[PDB]
Amino acid sequence: EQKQAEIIDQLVKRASTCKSEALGPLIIEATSHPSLFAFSEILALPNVAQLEGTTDSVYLDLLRLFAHGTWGDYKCNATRLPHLSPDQILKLKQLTVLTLAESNKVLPYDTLMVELDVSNVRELEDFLINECMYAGIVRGKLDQLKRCFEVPFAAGRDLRP
Numbered sequence: 001e002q003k004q005a006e007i008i009d010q011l012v013k014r015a016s017t018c019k020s021e022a023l024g025p026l027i028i029e030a031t032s033h034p035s036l037f038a039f040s041e042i043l044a045l046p047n048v049a050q051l052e053g054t055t056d057s058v059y060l061d062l063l064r065l066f067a068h069g070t071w072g073d074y075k076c077n078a079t080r081l082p083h084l085s086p087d088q089i090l091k092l093k094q095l096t097v098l099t100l101a102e103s104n105k106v107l108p109y110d111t112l113m114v115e116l117d118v119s120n121v122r123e124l125e126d127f128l129i130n131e132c133m134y135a136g137i138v139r140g141k142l143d144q145l146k147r148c149f150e151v152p153f154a155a156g157r158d159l160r161p
């Protein structure tokens, strides 16, 4: 954990040996993979960049989203992207927490709820503990009285060579 560096290795090796037709499926695989949170190195592959202009360009758009965007960016672009699976939705919400933690080491519950489309503090805390801390991508403290998440330790999305 990295575990991530290992999967990036396997994916880069496959992307640079497989037919270009296999790249869309590889992108769906990457964005569904339980241990993968950093997509920059994959996005930067010349193999992937060359999907632009092709029938699979929407999958490059999907990869760009997972590299750089938040759950909100997906909602904005949903009519021009494939529909996401539960695993992809979960991952984009986890990545959104990582983006927020990059900007601020104290995250108000109200901000988190808007960014993640979580309706209540229970659902929010459950997500932070049972999906984010569980995955090893953040370590911090929940302050129920102050309604905030103090997150000194968060995985970086722009983690790259």
Ligand SMILES: [Mg+2]
Pocket (backbone or CB within 6 Å): 037, 038, 039, 040, 066, 067, 068, 157, 158, 159
């Ligand atoms: Mg990334």
Ligand SMILES: [Mg+2]
Pocket (backbone or CB within 6 Å): 157, 158
């Ligand atoms: Mg960044």
